[PDB]
Amino acid sequence: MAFSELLDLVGGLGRFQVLQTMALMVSIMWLCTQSMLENFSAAVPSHRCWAPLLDNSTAQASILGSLSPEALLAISIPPGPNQRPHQCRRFRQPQWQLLDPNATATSWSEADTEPCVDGWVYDRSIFTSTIVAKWNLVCDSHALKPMAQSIYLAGILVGAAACGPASDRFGRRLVLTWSYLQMAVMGTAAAFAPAFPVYCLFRFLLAFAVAGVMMNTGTLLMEWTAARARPLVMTLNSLGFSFGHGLTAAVAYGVRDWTLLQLVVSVPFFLCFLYSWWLAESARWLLTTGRLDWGLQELWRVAAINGKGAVQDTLTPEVLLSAMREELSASLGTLLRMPGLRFRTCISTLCWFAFGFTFFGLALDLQALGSNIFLLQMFIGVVDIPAKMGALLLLSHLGRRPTLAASLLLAGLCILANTLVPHEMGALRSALAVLGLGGVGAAFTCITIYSSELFPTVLRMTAVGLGQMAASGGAILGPLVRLLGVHGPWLPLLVYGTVPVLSGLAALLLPETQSLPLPDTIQDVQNQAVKKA
């Protein structure tokens, strides 16, 4: 007996599936808020050295001559790039001669400057407080922000590496519930963190739980949803990220203190943990692992919730044990040791890498459209939505492989086409970038579904976990390839364009799905391979 007939008996569509889909989409939305928080909480405000004559009322009172704040700024801080105050240098002594209109802006020497010994004054008009303002992550410490992002993404990688095998061994509900609890507690502790390294530690452990939530949410959605409804529910889950982006912009717009923002974003996950006790674990995994009694209890619970109580008399434990007795009659190394699965795993991980690579590769044009980070994040979410819906329709009509390939090809072609557009002729760059990012979102929906369908239940979470680590590896490598950008302006765009085209071409080397039974066992994958011949 396959799981599909058991699901049809219990009712593979109903109030249970709707409630689980909405609850998990809401949790994915808040997880997105946790993921982009550092886009906002670690924004770098405009800053200058602290200067006595500007910022110490007592030193201002010692001047018998009134000066305007602009004059005090000119005399206290050298002009930096774009005629703004220099972010990293001050005058050792105030150069009052620079207020005289008969003076060139170069009438001073580097010997007249010293570092900001007394710290920095941050502009608080937009953000009341940031981690950058809290720990002075500017100038010499400017590298700590992308370092914090790299630590977070390494947390995602380690989370995927641990939570994959843990999900395969212990079950999806248990790992999901603990991931919600760990994320909620550690994120609250991050909100109350005294020092930046402690903040980085809590952010790493939060990202570990973020990986656990993302994987187990996707797994539960595919395993409880009937095959006909599976694309729609997975698309809704993928739209959860785009709505999470819009929610992120709205919440950060209302609460501009990073501590309060971290708290407001962490508190809903305690409620998510509390209702997450109500979620059903995957019946399919329970059946393939021989845990018939627990699988039965969960199937009866879902049948009761679906109003199909009359199926209780036909589902006896003897019939189920006999049916799995007939069907029956892990470690990443198992995935890499089995020849038919090795190639599929490698190509899936390559497509995940291409996703992570392409997002940060194309994320430079969005900067050209304007300034309000809240509006820009919202517009990213808004344009990400119809691309995902179109992807879902093409996934329903054309299947998983050509839609994924077309999305990766479109992304790579958009970045390469962006290479030929002159820098002066803007807006065309923005249009191509928005279409590109929409294609990347479509590619994300395609690769999440197709990766979830390619691998058998016993190995599915380990393979999805490996994919997620590869995606985080790409995300980590992106910015560093921008550091490779110093060795000529064409190298980063060439790499960011070549990775997704090559990944889409490699993605064409995959077996077509959407009309195959979902693989429960490794043996199911072999039967698909023999049928492919």
Side-chain angles (χ1 to χ4, degrees), residues 77-92 94 101 103 105 108-377:
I77 305 113
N82 313 332
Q83 301 184 347
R84 289 186 180 186
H86 196 282
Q87 287 170 357
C88 296
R89 291 324 274 121
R90 66 180 315 181
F91 294 117
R92 290 225 180 198
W108 58 271
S109 75
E110 280 292 327
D112 303 350
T113 72
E114 57 116 8
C116 316
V117 294
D118 299 295
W120 297 265
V121 181
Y122 299 99
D123 162 7
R124 298 189 182 310
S125 60
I126 168 175
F127 291 107
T128 312
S129 189
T130 83
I131 67 168
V132 176
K134 173 103 160 23
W135 296 296
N136 297 315
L137 309 175
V138 296
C139 205
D140 304 20
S141 278
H142 78 304
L144 294 182
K145 173 182 170 177
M147 187 246 184
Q149 286 293 84
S150 153
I151 290 299
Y152 175 89
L153 294 171
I156 306 267
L157 175 133
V158 177
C163 292
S167 267
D168 289 327
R169 289 256 326 124
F170 302 115
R172 299 72 175 110
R173 183 182 70 188
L174 189 78
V175 177
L176 182 62
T177 42
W178 295 136
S179 302
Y180 290 142
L181 184 61
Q182 182 176 333
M183 150 182 318
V185 177
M186 287 201 150
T188 305
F192 301 111
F196 178 74
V198 179
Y199 172 88
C200 291
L201 177 63
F202 292 142
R203 207 77 182 153
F204 177 96
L205 293 174
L206 177 147
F208 179 107
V210 166
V213 175
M214 287 180 335
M215 300 184 342
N216 289 286
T217 296
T219 304
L220 278 168
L221 286 170
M222 290 239 287
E223 286 176 343
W224 279 110
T225 322
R228 158 249 317 182
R230 166 174 320 172
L232 178 65
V233 174
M234 291 280 300
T235 299
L236 288 172
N237 185 74
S238 218
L239 290 174
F241 287 99
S242 317
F243 290 118
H245 279 102
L247 183 62
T248 288
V251 70
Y253 182 83
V255 287
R256 309 261 188 78
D257 185 276
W258 78 275
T259 64
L260 186 60
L261 185 63
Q262 180 66 37
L263 205 74
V264 168
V265 173
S266 287
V267 167
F269 294 105
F270 287 110
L271 303 178
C272 299
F273 170 71
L274 215 277
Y275 80 65
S276 186
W277 286 113
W278 254 257
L279 296 172
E281 186 174 274
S282 176
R284 331 179 89 260
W285 177 71
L286 288 171
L287 298 173
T288 326
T289 52
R291 293 175 254 231
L292 293 323
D293 275 302
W294 180 23
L296 272 169
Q297 197 245 312
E298 281 311 323
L299 286 169
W300 292 41
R301 183 181 180 212
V302 176
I305 295 167
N306 286 241
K308 293 198 180 187
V311 316
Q312 185 160 17
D313 298 60
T314 158
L315 220 34
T316 65
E318 295 268 310
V319 174
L320 214 79
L321 75 90
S322 294
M324 292 346 303
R325 192 232 72 83
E326 188 257 356
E327 171 59 53
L328 288 167
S329 306
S331 68
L332 255 189
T334 58
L335 287 169
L336 296 178
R337 77 174 79 177
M338 178 300 161
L341 284 168
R342 162 173 45 90
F343 185 55
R344 207 184 290 196
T345 204
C346 293
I347 296 315
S348 179
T349 51
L350 178 63
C351 298
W352 279 104
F353 178 87
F355 161 74
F357 224 61
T358 317
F359 183 83
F360 289 100
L362 84 82
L364 252 74
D365 303 332
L366 296 317
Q367 318 291 72
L369 292 112
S371 317
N372 189 331
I373 183 70
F374 304 101
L375 253 50
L376 192 63
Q377 287 307 308

